[PDB]
Structure formats: C-alpha cells, structure tokens
Ligand binder design. Structure first.
Ligand SMILES: C=C(C)CCOP(=O)(O)OP(=O)(O)O
Ligand SMILES: C=C(C)CCOP(=O)(O)OP(=O)(O)O
Ligand SMILES: [Mg+2]
Ligand SMILES: [Mg+2]
Ligand SMILES: [Mg+2]
Ligand SMILES: [Mg+2]
Ligand SMILES: [Mg+2]
Ligand SMILES: [Mg+2]
Ligand SMILES: [Mg+2]
Lengths: 288, 286
C-alpha cells in the first residue's frame, strides 16, 4: 500500500515492540521472578513510550534497530512504575486492564522484586542490546533514564501525587507539577533517548522536549474532561475541570496539542507521524 | 606513619565515600523523597562495597577519583536492597543498626519509592561523574550493575531466599546458590567494576571474581555460625553440615580468597587483609 495509515503504523510498531519484550525475558532460575516480570511486561497496552522512542529516533535519522532496545527499556520502566503503584502500600488496586494486579497473583514481595528486576534490566538491556550505538550517545541515554526514573522525575512525581491525596488545597499549579514529574519526565525521555541515539542536536532535542511535555499534559487534561463528563452522564480529588471549568480545560487541552504540533514544524514533513500521534491519542480517548 | 594500618585505611576510604554520598543528594521538591533516601544512604556502616571498588581499582592501576562514582552507585544499590528487604511485605523489620527502618520513619509507600530512586540514581551518578573513564569500560560497568541487581543477581537471590523458607530439601549447594545471587553478585560487581574502570585484564578480573565469591560465602557461613552459637524456619550451614564442618568451610573460603590474589604481588595486601578483618570484626561484634 502507498498511503500512510497512522492506526496501521502504530499496530506494526506495537507488534515489533511486543515481540522484542517477549524475547527479552527468557525464563531461567528462579523461574518465578521471570514469570512475574513477564506477567506485567507482556500484558499489552498502547506501547506509547517505545513507539515514541522509535519514531523520534527515525525522525532524527536513526533506525528501528538502534532505538528498539531503549524503547523496550522505557516500557520496562513504565511497567515497573505500574507494579509499584498498584501495591497495597500505594494505590491498593486489585485489578489493572481487567486482570489481577501483580501482587494479587504472586504476592506483594514478588511484585516489589519484579518491579526492581525490571528497572535493573532496563539499564542492562540498553547496553547489552545496542552494541552498534555511539558509546557517548549510549552513556547519555543511561544518564537520561536514571534522571527520568528518580527523585527529579517519575519517583518524585509519585511522591508529589501521594502527597496530594485527600488534600483540600489543590490548585492547577499543584496538578501540573505532579503531572510534569509523574508522566512528563518519562514521555520526554522516550522522544529524547531516541533523538540522542541518532545524534540529534541540542536544538532538535529542545523541540522534542516541548512536544513531549505538551502532549503529556494535554493527555491528563483530556482524561479529566472525560471523567467529569462521564459523571455528567452518571474520596475527593480535584481535576482540571473542577478547578478551571470545562470550557477553560478544553481550551487548555487544545492549546497544548496545538503547541506540540508547532514545536515539531521546523523538522519539516518528517515530523508528520509524531504530530499526528498527538491528535490521534486525544481523538481515541474521546472514542474509547 | 610508616606502618600500613588496615583500620586507618578503611576509616579514610569510608570518610571519602560518606562525604561523596552526602553531597550526592541535595534536598529539592519533593523534600520527603530526598529526606527518605538520605536517611538510609547516610546511616553509616562499613561501606564495604564502595571500599572494595576503590581498592580493586587502585590494585589494577586506577585511582580513587576514577572509582568513586561507581563506588557510590554500589552503595546506593546496596542501600535500596536493604530498604526493600526491611519492608512489611518482606522481612518486616522495625530496626536496622539499632535505628528505625525507612518505612517506620517515612511510611511503606515512601520507603518503596526511596529504594526505586536510589537504584535509578546509581546509574545516573556513574555516568555524570566519571567523564575520565573509557566510554566502553563505563558501559561495561553499567551493564554489570544492571545484571548484578536484577533477576540474575540480587533480586533473583531475594526470590531464591523466599523460596527456601520452610523447606526440608535445602542442601549446602542450594544455600550456596541463594548466597551467590543474594550477596555474591554485588560483592563481585564491587571489585570487578573497579577493575574494569582501571583496564584490568580478563585474567586479573577472574582472580578478583574468585576472591569476591569466596569472601561473600565465608561472610554468610560465619554469620550462620555466630547465629547458632548465640541460640520462619530456614536451614543454615551449621544446621546442614554441623558446626565443625561449617567452621572448616569458613576458614577454607577465606584461605582461598587470599590465595586467589597472591599473583598480583604485594599490591593485593589490602584486599587480602579486608577478607580476614571483616570475619574478625563479626566475631568481636558478637
Ligand atoms: C507513574 C504512574 C503514572 C503510575 C500510575 O498513575 P496513577 O496511580 O495515577 O494511575 P493508574 O494507572 O493507577 O490509574
Ligand atoms: C539483599 C540483601 C543482602 C538483603 C539482606 O539479607 P536478609 O533479610 O537475609 O538480611 P538482614 O535482613 O539480616 O539484613
Ligand atoms: Mg498512583
Ligand atoms: Mg494507581
Ligand atoms: Mg487526572
Ligand atoms: Mg509540517
Ligand atoms: Mg531478607
Ligand atoms: Mg544465614
Ligand atoms: Mg602476597
């Protein structure tokens, strides 16, 4: 076929990523830890972060083989964060994607350890499976992944989110600070690691970072819009529409997507798939 | 002073390591996560793994400045492992080194996350603070650290240790398999990362791996001897072998560790002495 079909693009990339994730975890002694990591890693989902990494790598002149190990590592980090998030000490969720959570299947101890194992493996896998990368670029990917996961990124965001729970003084600024850390850091890492592997300039990286921060926040604002309008069709937690109103929330979500698209215009037409992904993810949230 | 004094050597290396760990974590928002990571990282202790890393790097022709960031990363990883091990889902310890455990101070949620934050920071720190390393050697250190922590190392060891509880078929070989994963991988990583940074040969690295595996197992045998002589169900070296055979095995392992490093010449004397010193202090701190 000759016509770019975004749904098909995303389906093909998801298939490549899921085959690589499956192959990445060969069961060995002790089999339980591999089974528990695979239970969460291979559970499906959109695979957005690996897809963003591959797509940004290609945009900057790299190839899928260069990006794929780091793409897998990003999904291992994402997966670890969900395993830890679901625990009884954290969100205490029995189900995820309509299936029992890792700790409800294997125990809290095994779930904690499966998350730790996935986070360690992300770093190992980037190095062992990208021997063709420029070594200084690969070291920059490792530094970015460490910074992204830790107290200045995802883990800091998880702490900011826990601190907000049940508070009565939440503002839009407080929510945005949570989101930039809890989801924005890892979305930024997904596009920036792909770009770094391909040798992108600082200027190119700054445009991709603006794209990633904007789509991350837009996705959160849209999720809040759909939550409050489902409640319209039907503990206390403030949301963008509860704090700002639905009109202002809708205008902010649209502005953020528009700014993400404008951020990538200077790449030229090569940026069209990343620009399309921004609008597509939002449109699918409204349809699903 | 002209006499090599191991205790003084260790005190000076511990002071360098502790100053670097303290400087590594500047409090920022959210303050609680930095407070929780600092609480466990800066709790003191022997700092064995960072000191092994610096000592092995120096043995192989490297220096403290080359090794120090990796040494700090090893102690961040060690610290994470203890935070997670203490949790109510795992050992459920209220105290460590006579002080409240991380989750008793900050809560289980913050403790889990402080562990995750320390493991992430280990990899960041190694890369950002070692610009003078050969980049391929530094990548080999990163791969070694990730393999050491995960399913083929420490986390696999933690799972093998849980699986051993309340079993009747544990053998000395099965117990040794637990220990080589749960503590041996990280002790081996401590000396091998220092050696890799310095450009050690494969032959040198194989000797340091033998040293590390032997001291790690000796430390575990000695811990079991001291526990049973002070006295969830778990077999131990003395419960499986008897005390006489356990004592002979602990001595043999220390002897083998010392012999493993003889071919380096007198430069290996500090590492050789650390093996005997750690055992001697365990008996004295019993
Ligand atoms: C780091 C992240 C994003 C963990 C999941 O976030 P939440 O607890 O808010 O969301 P669920 O996926 O549990 O609904
Ligand atoms: C990964 C490691 C080494 C955790 C410590 O071992 P255990 O639970 O057996 O050790 P302690 O609690 O006695 O410190
Ligand atoms: Mg949560
Ligand atoms: Mg949750
Ligand atoms: Mg929301
Ligand atoms: Mg365009
Ligand atoms: Mg334990
Ligand atoms: Mg023991
Ligand atoms: Mg000698």
């Amino acid at each position: 076929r000759t016509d770019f079909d975004l749904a098909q693009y995303l389906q093909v990339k998801k298939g490549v990523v899921e085959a690589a994730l499956d192959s990445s975890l060969a069961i060995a002694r002790p089999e339980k830890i591999y089974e528990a990591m695979r239970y969460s890693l291979l559970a499906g989902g959109k695979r957005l972060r690996p897809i963003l990494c591959i797509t940004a790598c290609e945009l900057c002149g790299g190839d899928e083989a260069l990006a794929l190990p780091t793409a897998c590592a990003l999904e291992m980090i994402h997966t670890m964060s969900l395993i830890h998030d679901d625990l009884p000490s954290m969100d205490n969720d029995d189900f995820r994607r309509g299936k029992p959570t890792n700790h409800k299947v294997y125990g809290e101890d095994i779930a904690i350890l499966a998350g730790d194992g996935l986070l360690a493996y992300a770093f190992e896998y980037v190095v062992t499976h990208t021997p063709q990368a420029d070594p200084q670029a690969l070291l920059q990917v490792i530094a970015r992944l460490g910074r992204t996961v830790g107290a200045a990124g995802l883990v800091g965001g998880q702490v900011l989110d826990l601190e907000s729970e049940g508070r009565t003084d939440i503002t839009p600024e407080t929510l945005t600070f949570i989101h930039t850390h809890k989801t924005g850091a890892l979305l930024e890492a997904s596009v920036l690691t792909g770009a770094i592997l391909a040798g992108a300039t600082g200027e190119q990286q700054q445009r991709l970072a603006r794209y990633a921060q904007n789509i991350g926040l837009a996705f959160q604002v849209v999720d809040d819009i759909l939550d409050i309008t489902a409640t319209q069709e039907e503990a206390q937690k403030a949301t963008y529409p509860s704090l700002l109103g639905l009109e202002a929330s809708r205008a902010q979500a649209q502005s953020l997507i528009d700014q993400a698209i404008v951020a990538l215009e200077p790449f030229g037409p090569s940026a069209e798939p990343l620009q399309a992904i921004a609008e597509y993810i939002v449109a699918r949230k409204y349809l699903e």
